[PDB]
């Protein structure tokens, strides 16, 4: 099970595409547990049996199609810019509405992404060997 459109820069006045697929299987019903980057297994809608249609405050449409496809459409609400939208389980899909880090040699670092800004950190004599995060048009980087 995949969410082919993993993370991505959804913008203002925008509807989001996210297609759960499983071509090497056979399906039945699919859920779409929501969240924030921290709170947990929240929810959205789903399908039932093969396909029996779909609180009270919940623009997070869905429309199961083939035993294969079924996407969730989100039409730009104010900025909550992600939470692994997920659909057996599938990978994660980010959203949004910011880079240039530092690295060092011999520990790493990724910095540069009211406002409310952040930082995220990690860390770790053979020749030129290598060691190489996220932001979510598009984004990705490293620190060889």
């Amino acid at each position: 099970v995949s969410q082919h459109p993993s993370r991505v820069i959804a913008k203002s006045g925008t509807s989001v595409k996210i297609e759960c697929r499983s071509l090497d299987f056979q399906a039945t019903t699919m859920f779409w547990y929501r969240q924030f980057p921290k709170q947990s297994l929240m929810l959205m809608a789903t399908s039932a049996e093969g396909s029996k249609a779909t609180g009270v405050e919940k623009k997070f449409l869905i429309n199961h199609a083939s035993l294969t496809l079924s996407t969730l459409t989100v039409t730009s609400a104010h900025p909550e810019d992600s939470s692994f939208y997920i659909c057996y389980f599938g990978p994660g899909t980010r959203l949004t509405v910011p880079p240039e880090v530092a690295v060092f040699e011999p520990v790493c670092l990724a910095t540069g992404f009211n406002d409310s800004r952040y930082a995220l950190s990690s860390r770790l004599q053979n020749p030129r060997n290598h060691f190489r995060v996220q932001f979510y048009v598009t984004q990705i980087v490293s620190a060889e």
């Binding site: 399906a27 396909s51 249609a53 779909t54 429309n63 039409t75």
Partner: protein
């Protein structure tokens, strides 16, 4: 069976689907209220389709009767079968393209829909327009200035058949709506003259 809201988004859910389009299949066995067609060349070993049609709808087909499936489903797996209502007409022997002439009231719609059968189920016709209308005019969408609307298929025998564009019965699942196709109501092209779509 109530409410503007729930309906628009009661249909959009299922009319956003991919129909089975297995051409020239063979009927395993037929019984009461249903038809058993073979799709083991489109879907593999042991794979079949089951058409829940009207008693009248059956006794119209039997053992090996090359037929053509084309219908939207109401649920999913069992393992070797595929579920629907009707949409099973005789298999097309030669190839043909039938550009449909039509009108719209609320542009022009000639040659913007193309059937491929001389004898064509209503399910299909039904379907192919809805999508066109969805795709192009976004109707079953939360956003939309369309309360009601229906399709009027017209024959060479002065007779506009009706089709309700904005209708969603009892509960509201795929079974609650695709049942309107259990009648296996067909139509011959040489007797089809055009379609008048009305958006209100």
């Amino acid at each position: 069976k109530k409410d503007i809201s729930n309906v628009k988004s009661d249909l959009l859910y299922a009319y956003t689907i991919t129909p089975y389009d297995y051409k020239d299949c063979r009927v395993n066995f037929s019984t009461t209220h249903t038809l058993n067609i073979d799709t083991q060349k489109y879907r593999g070993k042991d794979y079949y389709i089951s058409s829940e049609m009207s008693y009248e709808a059956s006794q119209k087909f039997k053992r090996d009767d090359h037929v053509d499936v084309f219908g939207l489903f109401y649920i999913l797996n069992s393992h070797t079968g595929e579920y629907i209502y009707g949409g099973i007409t005789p298999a097309q022997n030669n190839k043909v393209n039938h550009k449909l002439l039509g009108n719209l009231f609320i542009q022009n719609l000639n040659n913007k829909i193309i059937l491929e059968k001389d004898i064509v189920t209503f399910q299909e016709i039904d379907f192919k327009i809805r999508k066109y209308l969805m795709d192009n005019y976004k109707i079953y969408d939360a956003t939309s200035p369309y309360v009601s609307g229906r399709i009027e298929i017209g024959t060479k025998d002065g007779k506009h058949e009706q089709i309700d564009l904005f209708d969603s019965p009892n509960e509201g699942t795929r079974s609650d709506i695709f049942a309107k196709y259990k009648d296996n109501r067909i139509i011959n092209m040489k007797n089809f003259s055009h379609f008048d779509i009305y958006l209100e």
